[PDB]
Amino acid sequence: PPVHPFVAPLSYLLGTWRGQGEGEYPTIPSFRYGEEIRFSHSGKPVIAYTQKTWKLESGAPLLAESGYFRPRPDGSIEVVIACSTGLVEVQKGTYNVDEQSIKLKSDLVGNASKVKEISREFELVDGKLSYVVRLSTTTNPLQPHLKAILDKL
Amino acid sequence: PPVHPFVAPLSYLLGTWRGQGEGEYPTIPSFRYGEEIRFSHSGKPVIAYTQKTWKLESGAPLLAESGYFRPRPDGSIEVVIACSTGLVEVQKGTYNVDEQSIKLKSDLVGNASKVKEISREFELVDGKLSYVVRLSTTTNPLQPHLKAILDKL
Numbered sequence: 001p002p003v004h005p006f007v008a009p010l011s012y013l014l015g016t017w018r019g020q021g022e023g024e025y026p027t028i029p030s031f032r033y034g035e036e037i038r039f040s041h042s043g044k045p046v047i048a049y050t051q052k053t054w055k056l057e058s059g060a061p062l063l064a065e066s067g068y069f070r071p072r073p074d075g076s077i078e079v080v081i082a083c084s085t086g087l088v089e090v091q092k093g094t095y096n097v098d099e100q101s102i103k104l105k106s107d108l109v110g111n112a113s114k115v116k117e118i119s120r121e122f123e124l125v126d127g128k129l130s131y132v133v134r135l136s137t138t139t140n141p142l143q144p145h146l147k148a149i150l151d152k153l
Numbered sequence: 154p155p156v157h158p159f160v161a162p163l164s165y166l167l168g169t170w171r172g173q174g175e176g177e178y179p180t181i182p183s184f185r186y187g188e189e190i191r192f193s194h195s196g197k198p199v200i201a202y203t204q205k206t207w208k209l210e211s212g213a214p215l216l217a218e219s220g221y222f223r224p225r226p227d228g229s230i231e232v233v234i235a236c237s238t239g240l241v242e243v244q245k246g247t248y249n250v251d252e253q254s255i256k257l258k259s260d261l262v263g264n265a266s267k268v269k270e271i272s273r274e275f276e277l278v279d280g281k282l283s284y285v286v287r288l289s290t291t292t293n294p295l296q297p298h299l300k301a302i303l304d305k306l
C-alpha cells in the first residue's frame with residue numbers, strides 16, 4: 001500500500017536496522033548489547049515498530065518490544081510500546097523534519113515496579129539511527145540508561 | 154530455542170491462526186472482520202503476540218496490535234498489549250490447563266478517550282482459538298465488544 005500522508009515525513013525510518021548499544025544506571029554495572037529494529041506500515045497513519053536485543057558475543061536473546069508510532073502533520077507524535085519485561089509506555093512528543101529527530105516523553109509507564117518516567121529520543125545521523133533512552137525512578141531523576149546506533153540494512 | 158518451562162503449558166498457542174470475528178456495542182452497528190494472530194517465543198518465559206484485522210471482502214487492512222504474554226507456574230499470567238489505535242493495556246488473570254483457557258482483565262488501559270476497562274478471554278475449542286473481548290466506558294458497563302474464532306494454520 002502507499003505510504004499514508006501522515007507517515008511520509010518519517011519514511012526514512014521504514015526498513016530494518018541493526019547495530020549495538022550500551023546501558024548504564026547509577027545502581028548497575030554498564031553493559032553492551034546488539035539491537036535490531038523494524039519499522040513497517042500498512043497504509044494507515046501508523047508505523048509498526050518491532051525491536052529485539054541480544055548478547056553481542058553469542059547472539060543469545062535478551063529482550064524485545066513492539067508498538068506503534070502515530071505522527072501527525074503538525075509535528076506531534078504519539079508512540080505506544082509494550083515490552084517483553086511486562087511494561088507498557090505511552091510516549092508523546094514531536095518530530096522535526098529538518099533535524100530528522102523524534103523527541104518523546106512518557107505520559108504513562110504501566111506495570112513498572114520502579115520506573116516512573118521514560119524519555120526516548122531518536123536522531124538520524126549520517127544515515128544511521130541513533131537513540132537515547134532516559135529513565136527515572138522515585139529516587140533517581142531522569143537520566144541516561146540506553147544509547148544505541150543502528151545501520152540501515 | 155527450547156520452550157521455556159513457564160511457556161510450555163501454553164505451547165498450544167504457538168503458531169499462526171486465522172479466522173473471522175464480529176464486533177458490537179450499544180452505540181454502534183455490528184460489524185465483521187478477518188483476523189490473524191501469531192504467537193512465538195525466543196526461549197524466555199514470554200510469548201510474543203502479534204495480530205491484525207482486515208475487511209472480509211477485500212482484505213483491506215483495519216487494525217493491528219502486539220504484545221507479550223507472561224505465564225507463571227501458579228497459573229497466573231500478565232499480558233501487555235500495544236494497539237495501532239494508540240491504546241495500551243496491562244491485562245492480568247489466570248490460565249487453566251484442563252480447560253485450555255486464559256481469562257484476563259485490565260489493570261490499566263492507557264491513552265484511551267472513552268474505554269475504562271477491557272477483559273479478554275481465550276478458549277481452545279476443538280482445536281480452534283476462540284476469544285471474547287469485553288469493554289466498559291464511564292457510562293457503559295463491561296459487556297461484549299468482539300468475538301472471534303480462528304483456525305490454526
Ligand code: MNH
Binds near residue numbers: 053118137146
Ligand atoms: C525502555 C525499557 C527499559 C526500562 C524501563 C529499563 C529499566 C531498568 C531498571 C528500572 C533497572 C534497575 C534499576 C534500579 O534502580 O534498580 C534496569 C537495569 C538493567 N537493565 Mn534496563 N535494559 C533494557 C531496557 C530497559 N530497562 C534493555 C533493552 C536491556 C538489555 C538488552 C537492559 C538491561 C539491563 C540490565 C542488564 C540491568 C541490570 C540488572 C538489574 O538490576 O535488573 N533497567
Ligand code: MNH
Binds near residue numbers: 178186207240271
Ligand atoms: C481491544 C481493542 C478495542 C478497543 C478498546 C475498542 C473500542 C471501541 C470504542 C470505545 C468504540 C466506540 C464506542 C463508544 O461508546 O463511542 C468502538 C467502536 C468501533 N470499533 Mn472497536 N474495534 C476493534 C477493537 C477495539 N475497539 C477492532 C479490532 C475492530 C475492527 C478490526 C474494531 C471496530 C470498531 C468499529 C468499526 C467501531 C464503530 C466506529 C466508532 O464508533 O468509532 N470500539
